[PDB]
Amino acid sequence: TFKILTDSTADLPESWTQENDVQVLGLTVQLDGITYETVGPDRLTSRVLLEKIAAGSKPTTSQVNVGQFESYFRQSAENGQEVLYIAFSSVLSGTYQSAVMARDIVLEEYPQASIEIVDTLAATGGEGYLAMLAAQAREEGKSLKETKELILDVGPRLRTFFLVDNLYHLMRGGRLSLVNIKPLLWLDASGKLVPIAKLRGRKKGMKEMLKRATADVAHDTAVVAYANDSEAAENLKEQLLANEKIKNVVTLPLGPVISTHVGPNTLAVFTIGKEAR
Numbered sequence: 001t002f003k004i005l006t007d008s009t010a011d012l013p014e015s016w017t018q019e020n021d022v023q024v025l026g027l028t029v030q031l032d033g034i035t036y037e038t039v040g041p042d043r044l045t046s047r048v049l050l051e052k053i054a055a056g057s058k059p060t061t062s063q064v065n066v067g068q069f070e071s072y073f074r075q076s077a078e079n080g081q082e083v084l085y086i087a088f089s090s091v092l093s094g095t096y097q098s099a100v101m102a103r104d105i106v107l108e109e110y111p112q113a114s115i116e117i118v119d120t121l122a123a124t125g126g127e128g129y130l131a132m133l134a135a136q137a138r139e140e141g142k143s144l145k146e147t148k149e150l151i152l153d154v155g156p157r158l159r160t161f162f163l164v165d166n167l168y169h170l171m172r173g174g175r176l177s178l179v180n181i182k183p184l185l186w187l188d189a190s191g192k193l194v195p196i197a198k199l200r201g202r203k204k205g206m207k208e209m210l211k212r213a214t215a216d217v218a219h220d221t222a223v224v225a226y227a228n229d230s231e232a233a234e235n236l237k238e239q240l241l242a243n244e245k246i247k248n249v250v251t252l253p254l255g256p257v258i259s260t261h262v263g264p265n266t267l268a269v270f271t272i273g274k275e276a277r
């Protein structure tokens with residue numbers, strides 16, 4: 001019944017969205033004078049992005065435009081279809097607010113139409129997992145309202161711990177001895193980015209991230225994301241799966257919009273606690 005829409009910052013694999021009937025509106029990357037798509041056959045990849053960033057290219061990102069949500073929303077209302085939009089955190093992008101404005105314009109044309117927008121206060125794998133729980137609820141025949149309620153319950157309980165090389169691109173992007181120091185960050189209850197530890201070295205950074213992620217597990221699945229290093233993510237995966245509470249691990253490469261902000265060698269772990277973080 002209801003359609004599920006998300007955005008390219010949820011970092012869902014194309015194969016998953018195709019097979020799961022989830023649509024994705026692309027944010028853009030501005031990279032050395034050109035605007036790249038982040039969805040479609042011509043989408044910019046993180047591998048290409050990070051390569052350019054290593055040679056000194058300072059790429060910036062842009063929100064989804066009101067027009068994109070307009071078209072999608074209007075097409076759905078025209079077709080008698082309900083819509084759930086699992087949205088990239090409102091505190092990191094004006095994407096959510098543009099969708100809200102687009103919904104306003106469409107409800108003018110289609111006053112009885114059904115369009116729910118969830119401000120996940122999330123990012124990348126976290127956001128993606130929320131969409132995955134939303135596609136699972138849809139399978140189980142939950143309504144749009146019930147699915148909205150599920151995501152609004154789960155979202156505040158999602159933990160996001162992420163380990164970076166430094167704060168350079170994070171501070172450069174506007175959303176935020178140091179030799180061999182790996183900062184560890186999280187998203188607080190407001191969805192704000194907040195350093196919580198500075199580890200001497202990647203092995204310690206990972207250990208700490210694993211410890212914090214596994215402090216409070218109330219759900220059998222964890223998510224690991226990585227910028228560059230797929231073997232490092234595998235090591236996180238194995239460790240996670242060694243918790244009796246963790247039965248599954250979803251592993252997702254970071255997409256280029258997120259990668260533009262966090263930088264290379266980023267690792268992240270997403271888990272769901274019993275209570276709201």
Ligand SMILES: CCCCCCCCCCCCCCCC(=O)O
Pocket residue numbers: 027061062063064092093094095123124160162173175187193225254257258261262266267268
């Ligand atoms: C693995 C990293 C975890 C992600 C948690 C948040 C990381 C900060 C990323 C900021 C992304 C901001 C993208 C802004 C898009 C836009 O231009 O509107």
